[PDB]
Amino acid sequence: VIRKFTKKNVARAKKKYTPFSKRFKSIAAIPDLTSLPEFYGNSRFENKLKTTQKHQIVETIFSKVKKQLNSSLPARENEFASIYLSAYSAIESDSATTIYVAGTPGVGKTLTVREVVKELLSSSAQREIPDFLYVEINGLKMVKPTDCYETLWNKVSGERLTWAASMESLEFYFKRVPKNKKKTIVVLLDELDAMVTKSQDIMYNFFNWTTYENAKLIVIAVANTMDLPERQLGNKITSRIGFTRIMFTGYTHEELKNIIDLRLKGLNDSFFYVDTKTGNAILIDVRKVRLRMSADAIEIASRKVASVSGDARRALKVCKRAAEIAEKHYMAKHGYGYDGVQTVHITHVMKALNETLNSHVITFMTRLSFTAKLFIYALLNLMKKNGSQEQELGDIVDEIKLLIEVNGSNKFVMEIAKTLFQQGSDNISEQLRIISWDFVLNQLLDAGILFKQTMKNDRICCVKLNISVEEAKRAMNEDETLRNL
Amino acid sequence: LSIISKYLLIASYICSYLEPRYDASIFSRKTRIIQGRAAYGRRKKKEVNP
């Protein structure tokens, strides 16, 4: 038969369509799912990425410092206690509950929740509480937002079903199955804002299963914002999530110090056998070298990060960047390759902090050609003349022509007018646009300095500055020629 | 086109290219029992060729 179109790349998973409510003949016929081989969880790729080294690589003194500062809990004790007490009471009373946690990035939400469920699993290993199943659902790690329905049911039953069948199965399992035939499930919903669809059915279902009497379900919902339910969710879901919500504040600088010095307990103020032939250092031709990080360097890093964000990732990356700068300076002076006392002091931390804060924008427009800077200068002149923050391109063409023909006594303009309008030939006729007109316009568009409107008339098309006018004039004043006229 | 269709097209052209407030100054030709005045027309012609 003749097809109107073809779908030759369809890849369909092997997932059944029959839900759990039809799996048994009656409610009384459902067995103990805890005593089932495939229920409640009762790494095939990790050998793929291995090879032989055939080399002994050099690990300098700063390498152990840089590995100790990677993201891969002295300051989270009240939040740990609250989350642990709520989850513990819900587990050992066979209750269903929702624990809401919100915060800015890198303040330790995921780490605290994972340590809470680790200590809960340790409690259930010694029979202080009934045994439970732990499930992680990250909303940013799903292809489709409905795949969470597929994931949780697969973690509960071992079945592979499609998403509507999975959510029917989960609805039947939480609602109708008796408690004595079930197990407690703790579900971490990480990145909750990613699980928000147009119709909020996933959020309603996940928080409404926690209001079922038989469910034995605990949902730990981790969100960006305290008032995410009030901003983006319905009143029923906001009622079901609750009024009691746990805020993870940004870290103060004493806590960022505590985190960094907890990362630097075993190598800060310690000795190394350095082997100055290669620089490969071994922790206790060969010298005993003390390594230290300055406490005031950690102080200024922690103070800057705690004022700006309180992010632990940012503080660890700042200290790691400082160690990288010190290691680059160290390997420059010896030529150690990769195959006394060395200190990560204040200035490395300051150079690491300022390299994220210095702007390349003014440096970028400084090193442009004459024609691009002439474009920017004419656009600034038109912006101050007619007061508009949006200028027609034909006006910019006429302004460039006017600035060339008015400042015709300038020596640079005398030297460059023939280049700008004839490419210095006297065989090319006089042009209506300058040489490299479309080039510098497209260059300022790729850089994001300019915005242009989608019109096909070139003269009446408008152009806007996407950067600050003060930055543009500061760039234009650095040039010797354009600051004169 | 028929007789009615051609005159409907002619009237549509007249409607599109003449202003409606000059209508009673042109086509009005019936006598009156009640006192009344028709539209005087355009006081001066425009030079735009509509």
């Binding site: 509507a164 059915d201 009143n235 009024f243 009691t244 | -």
Partner: protein, 152 residues
């Protein structure tokens, strides 16, 4: 039937059939098929979350399409159908019954009647009345009071 755990709104008639069916399985995509199935016989359907039957982005008249069919067949002669539809007012002819938000005295009554199964009440009663008064109002949500006492 909770109406959120439904694929499309227009399948609700089919969802009414699968509750009341042993047997043959028919295709129901309109009010007419469910009517002619329920004509030769009474039937009571509680529809929780009636707001999910609204069709989004389909103009004001055609958005309420399925709900007019349900509430019209719910009044039709010589068919035997009682339709109870609960919904929520903050998230959105039949007889209308309103569940007003609870007052502090009603919340006190609910709290002591729920706590009656325990050997003792661990709260002071001015604490319970203070919690009830601080939780009641224009949003008398009992979930908020339960959360406040649990947090205490």
């Amino acid at each position: 039937i909770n109406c959120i755990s439904l694929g499309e709104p227009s399948s609700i008639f089919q969802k009414i059939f699968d509750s009341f069916q042993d047997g043959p399985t028919l295709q129901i995509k309109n009010m007419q098929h469910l009517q002619k199935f329920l004509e030769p016989y009474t039937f009571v359907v509680v529809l929780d979350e009636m707001d999910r039957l609204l069709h989004a982005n389909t103009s004001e008249t055609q958005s309420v399409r399925t709900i007019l069919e349900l509430f019209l067949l719910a009044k039709l002669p010589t068919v035997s159908f009682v339709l109870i539809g609960m919904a929520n007012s903050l998230d959105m002819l039949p007889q209308t019954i309103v569940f007003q938000p609870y007052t502090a005295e009603q919340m006190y009554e609910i709290v002591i009647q729920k706590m009656s199964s325990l050997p003792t009440i661990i709260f002071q009663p001015m604490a319970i009345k203070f919690a009830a008064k601080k939780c009641a109002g224009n949003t008398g949500d009992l979930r908020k009071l339960f959360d406040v006492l649990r947090g205490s």
